[PDB]
Amino acid sequence: AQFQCQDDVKPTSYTTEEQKLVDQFWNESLIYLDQYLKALETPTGQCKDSAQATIQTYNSETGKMQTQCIMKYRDVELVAKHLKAVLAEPDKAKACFDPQKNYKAFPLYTPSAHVQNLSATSKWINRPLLTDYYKKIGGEIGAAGLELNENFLEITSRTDTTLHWTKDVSIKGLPTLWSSVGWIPFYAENPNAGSDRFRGGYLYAEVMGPWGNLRIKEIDGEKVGAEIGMTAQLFNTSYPYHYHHPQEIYMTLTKPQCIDQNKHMVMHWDNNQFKQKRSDNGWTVNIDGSKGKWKKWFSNQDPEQNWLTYFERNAIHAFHTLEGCNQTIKNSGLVTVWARTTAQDNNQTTQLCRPMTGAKDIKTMKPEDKAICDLDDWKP
């Protein structure tokens, strides 16, 4: 196959020592991607040829969860095809691999010195630390960011990969990868992103994709849509209802301490539990989960049964960690393998719904609060 790297991949010369640090990072990236491919393709549940994924946590007609075999989606098949090409010719794919030591697009971080010390690679890359970032921010956002990042290893280690992976893809098994990838406090400065604790208590990182360490633009002329990485969300937070053009996949790593520790919702934009009005080349979607109505929309997540979920384009989704033992645990959260399948077409923006009652209620946003989502049409 012929690999074309993204435009911001600049071939670099490393010393013999540096190359060994790059090589360990690359080797663990390949393990992560091979395991990702196996997680897509290995049959589970009642699916014969690929993994069984949740696609709606509440189907309005059945009143039940709705699933699909994940490789039935052509965009997922294409991710699998591109991962196979990477894994078949890793030396060629490596031309597009960059440790992002001097990455200019935006800041990338390491959670803490403790996490940085997990690998010589992470130490050499020497990203700014999130503990420093949140100490400077201060306030309630900084307090949440300190709680997550000072306890990052404990939070991200409370995982069980033994049922749906054949190697430990967590920070325990791939420490160079998890310590060296660029972590992003995506919501710390976003005033629309819900509570201060959620904003400080949220991170993601990208291993492969247009902003990852592996940045392949095309393989054999096909645009690579795959964007693969990980997310971490602090316990006792609610990620507000949100939506976006790219289809998305979540694989839950966290082993929960109670069945309802980590709840998620995914419902298609036209689900009859919501109210939709056509806008201008889009839809206004009103969500009223008040007075307990939200509860049936949310399902529990765990690394055994409800481990895999696929979000169709513009599907409304949310991740909720306020219930149950979130009121008794500590140093916990929701940690996932995260991916999008079409990262190079349409609008990549992660869009947030907003409170029906206005901006004054953003900081308490949670599933029971009425919300408005302004969806845009995508190009088929």
Q: Which is nearer to Zn ion, 158 or 340 (CB)?
A: 340
- The distance of closest approach from Cβ of residue 266 to Zn ion in the complex, given in angstroms and rounded to an integer, is 9
Q: Which is nearer to Zn ion, 160 or 227 (CB)?
A: 227
Q: Which is nearer to Zn ion, 290 or 349 (CB)?
A: 349
- The distance of closest approach from Cβ of residue 175 to Zn ion in the complex, given in angstroms and rounded to an integer, is 27
Q: Which is nearer to Zn ion, 206 or 248 (CB)?
A: 248
Our finding on whether 206 is near Zn ion (CB under 5 A) is no
Tokens, residue 168: 């430990």
- The distance of closest approach from Cβ of residue 132 to Zn ion in the complex, given in angstroms and rounded to an integer, is 28
Tokens, residue 78: 């294409």
The residue range among 23-31, 40-48, 127-135, 248-256 that interacts with Zn ion, by the rule CB under 5 A, is 248-256
The candidate with the shortest Cα–Cα distance to 333, out of 109, 145, 54, 114, is 145
Return the exposure string of 119-128: e unless at least 16 CB atoms fall within 10 Å of the residue's CB, then b.
bbbbbbbebe
The contact mask relative to Zn ion for 152-191 (x = CB under 5 A, - = no) is ----------------------------------------
Q: In what order do the strands lie in the sheet with 308-311?
A: 66-69, 52-56, 308-311, 248-252, 333-340, 227-234, 202-208, 183-184
- The distance of closest approach from Cβ of residue 330 to Zn ion in the complex, given in angstroms and rounded to an integer, is 27
The residue range among 22-30, 125-133, 231-239, 243-251 that interacts with Zn ion, by the rule CB under 5 A, is 243-251
Bind-site residues: 244, 248, 317
Count of Cβ atoms closer than 10 Å to residue 148 Cβ: 28
d(CA 282, CA 377): 5
The single-letter DSSP state of residue 273 is T
Mutual orientation of helices 130-137 and 139-150 as an angle, nearest 10°? 160
The candidate with the shortest Cα–Cα distance to 319, out of 202, 160, 226, is 202
d(CA 330, CA 306): 23
d(CA 270, CA 81): 30
Tokens, residue 204: 């993601």
Q: Which is nearer to Zn ion, 36 or 97 (CB)?
A: 36
Residue 229 three-state SS: strand
The radius of gyration of the chain's CA atoms, rounded to the nearest angstrom, is 20
The residue range among 244-252, 279-287, 325-333, 357-365 that interacts with Zn ion, by the rule CB under 5 A, is 244-252
The contact mask relative to Zn ion for 72-111 (x = CB under 5 A, - = no) is ----------------------------------------
- The distance of closest approach from Cβ of residue 311 to Zn ion in the complex, given in angstroms and rounded to an integer, is 6
Q: Which is nearer to Zn ion, 21 or 205 (CB)?
A: 205
Contact yes or no for 352/240 (Cβ under 8 A): yes
d(CA 210, CA 322): 33
Q: Which residue is nearest to Zn ion (CB)?
A: 248
Size, binding site for Zn ion by CB under 5 A? 1
Bind-site residues for Zn(2+): 244, 248, 317
Using CB under 5 A, pick the residue from 34, 206, 248, 369 that binds Zn ion.
248
- The distance of closest approach from Cβ of residue 296 to Zn ion in the complex, given in angstroms and rounded to an integer, is 21
- The distance of closest approach from Cβ of residue 349 to Zn ion in the complex, given in angstroms and rounded to an integer, is 11
Q: Which is nearer to Zn ion, 127 or 317 (CB)?
A: 317
Tokens, residue 313: 């384009």
Q: Which residues contact Zn ion (rule: CB under 5 A)?
A: 248
